[PDB]
Design a protein around this ligand. Structure first.
Ligand SMILES: NCCCC[C@H](NCc1ccc(-c2cccnc2)cc1)C(N)=O
Length: 426
């Protein structure tokens, strides 16, 4: 019926003085833009069709053409950034926002999807969607007693669009808009559907990606326990953003970090630090590195949960990027830990896998490790044990690796490599 039209025929139809001929051609445009192998999006834009589509959004009297042009537009908006730009420059935004209140859910859903692609494109369009007043009628669509009564795809759609209004930085979303969206987000974070849960987690991880004031307004809503619980989920699409949000929160103050520990997060980490998925292991170690950079009582809680052997583990064998995070975790730990805590880290076997990494030709992990070896020696000084530690380091070929580091380009590598040699080796 409306399949395989040319662009010139779509144009002929959309230009006629006949609403039905136009509906027909609009639907033809929609199918053409929906095709899987390269849809002629730029041919449609060049044909001048977007202002016509956008004007059909207003045809209250003809809901089917509202729907087809809506859909045609979202196919273009979901394309590249300049394609999205074309849609916004057609005056689509206030037109789509008016459609959120449409009696027809198939049309409201379409406007939700459109707005999510426009907002998701970047900071300026996100903020422009918010200025045109999108947030109120978006939140109005979830003002039901129980979310379980909404259509599943409809709910995933709204959730996904809210996550895009939380997304991007420079600038981050307006505080006013975040505070307005945040309560609905908390509610969706408790909804039982894996995709609504993944999108909400992403929303939260976008909001926690910033300065402590931002982390605070999220933490203050009490989502951290629900985050930790999702950190435990079986679905990798839920764990991945849940771990990102937790990882963000512990880059904040000691008190915010402590909220995560109190929530029971550390009990999940033996799994996370041995996870078969490389990125989960990378983010979990990065998270550990921000927890061992906190207070001594927080370092101690890492110890009490039996997490130090898992750090020794990651340091020993992991993707190199994860090993770098692990070395940071160790340096932070050795930097702010008590003498007892640093001693324990040596008993768990940190020295040898530490030394092995001094063979990595990455200048900044070497700095980090040499700094860590230095912190450990200072703990050994307060016990007159620089002795035994030197022997340990010597026995796993750790001295050979530091001697040789007295011939590695970098300034700080020598002045530490040399210094260590002078100070603790004959
Ligand atoms: N809860 C506090 C979070 C901030 C930590 C801060 N500085 C310590 C530090 C240094 C380097 C890293 C790092 C760099 C690259 C990759 N991974 C980890 C992380 C932390 C501090 N409190 O002392």
């Amino acid at each position: 019926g409306t399949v395989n039209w040319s662009v010139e025929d779509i144009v002929k139809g959309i230009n006629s003085n006949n609403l039905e001929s136009q509906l027909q051609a609009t639907q033809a445009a929609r199918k053409l833009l929906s095709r899987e192998k390269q849809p002629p999006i730029d041919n449609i834009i060049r044909a001048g069709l977007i202002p016509k589509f956008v004007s059909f959004l207003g045809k209250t009297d003809c809901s089917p053409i509202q729907f087809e042009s809506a859909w045609a537009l979202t196919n273009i908006a979901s394309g590249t950034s300049e394609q999205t730009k074309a849609v916004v420059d057609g005056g689509a935004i206030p037109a789509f926002i008016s459609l959120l209140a449409s009696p027809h859910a198939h049309i409201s859903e379409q406007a939700v999807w459109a707005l999510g692609n426009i907002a998701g494109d970047g900071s300026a369009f996100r903020d422009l969607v918010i200025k045109h007043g999108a947030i109120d009628p978006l939140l109005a669509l979830l003002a039901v007693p129980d979310l379980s009564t909404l259509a599943c795809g409809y709910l995933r759609n709204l959730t996904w669009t809210l996550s895009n209004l939380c997304r991007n930085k420079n600038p981050a979303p307006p505080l006013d808009a975040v505070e307005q969206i945040l309560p609905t987000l908390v509610r969706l974070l408790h909804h039982n559907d894996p995709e609504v849960l993944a999108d909400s987690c992403w929303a939260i991880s976008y909001l926690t990606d910033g300065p402590n004031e931002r982390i605070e307004m999220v933490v203050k809503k009490g989502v951290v326990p629900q985050l930790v619980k999702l950190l435990g989920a079986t679905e990798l699409p839920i764990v991945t953003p849940a771990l990102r949000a937790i990882g963000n929160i512990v880059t904040g103050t000691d008190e915010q970090t402590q909220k995560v520990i109190d929530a029971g997060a550390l009990a999940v980490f033996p799994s996370l630090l041995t996870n078969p998925k490389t990125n989960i292991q990378k983010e979990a170690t990065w998270t550990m590195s921000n927890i061992t950079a906190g207070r001594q009582d927080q370092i101690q809680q890492v110890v009490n949960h039996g997490l130090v052997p898992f750090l020794v583990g990651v340091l020993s064998k992991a993707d190199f990027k994860t090993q770098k995070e692990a070395a940071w975790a160790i340096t932070n730990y050795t930097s702010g830990g008590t003498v007892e805590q640093i001693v324990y880290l040596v008993h768990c076997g940190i020295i040898e896998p530490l030394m092995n990494l001094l063979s990595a030709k990455d200048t900044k992990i070497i700095q980090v490790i040499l700094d860590a070896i230095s912190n450990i020696f200072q703990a050994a000084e307060k016990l007159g044990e620089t002795e035994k530690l030197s022997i340990m380091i010597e026995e796993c070929g750790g001295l050979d690796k530091i001697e040789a580091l007295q011939r590695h380009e970098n300034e700080s590598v020598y002045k530490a490599s040399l210094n260590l040699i002078e100070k603790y080796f004959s």
